[PDB]
Amino acid sequence: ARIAGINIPDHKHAVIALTSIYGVGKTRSKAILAAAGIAEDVKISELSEGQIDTLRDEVAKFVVEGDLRREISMSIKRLMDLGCYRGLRHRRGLPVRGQRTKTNARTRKGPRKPI
């Protein structure tokens, strides 16, 4: 129900439900469940409180949620403070991985802004 300071969906299968945690994807979700000895198909509601506690211990092994967000924020901040090319791209809100900017790049640039 409540893991890593968030509420996971009870109705969903455990493997899907765990992915609700930031920093946990399908692979990590499967690993956590395998370590906890809980089947992926089992719904969170079906799991006992003891079973939920085992899941909580497994999640604690990986950096997740706020701790992950802090790490990601610091990494981007470092680049921007460095003034490296990547940092400059983060500052300008342009693609950082050498994609084209003549067209596209709408995800970084946002909606088209008329001249």
Partner: protein, 84 residues
């Protein structure tokens, strides 16, 4: 990124210059065209002027800069915005 087994890449001429500069003491900024050379721990505290294609841009190496290529800190294209 360059394979770990191959190790970090630096141009030999730059490496020699850095070693000489470190041995000599505080020095006038090193002038290099080797944008591709990785920044090494020994370089920290040295100013390296990296060519951006038209001018050598002074870079003061710091601990955070280590493990990055020199060219990363010298911008090749100039853009001040459209209709600016």
């Amino acid at each position: 990124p360059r394979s770990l087994k191959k190790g970090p890449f630096i141009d030999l001429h730059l490496l020699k210059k850095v070693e000489k500069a470190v041995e000599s003491g505080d020095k006038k900024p090193l002038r290099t065209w080797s944008r591709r050379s990785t920044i090494f721990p020994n370089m920290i505290g040295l100013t390296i002027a990296v060519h951006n294609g038209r001018q050598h841009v002074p870079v003061f190496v710091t601990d955070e800069m280590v493990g990055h290529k020199l060219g990363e800190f010298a911008p090749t294209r100039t853009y001040r915005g459209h209709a600016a």
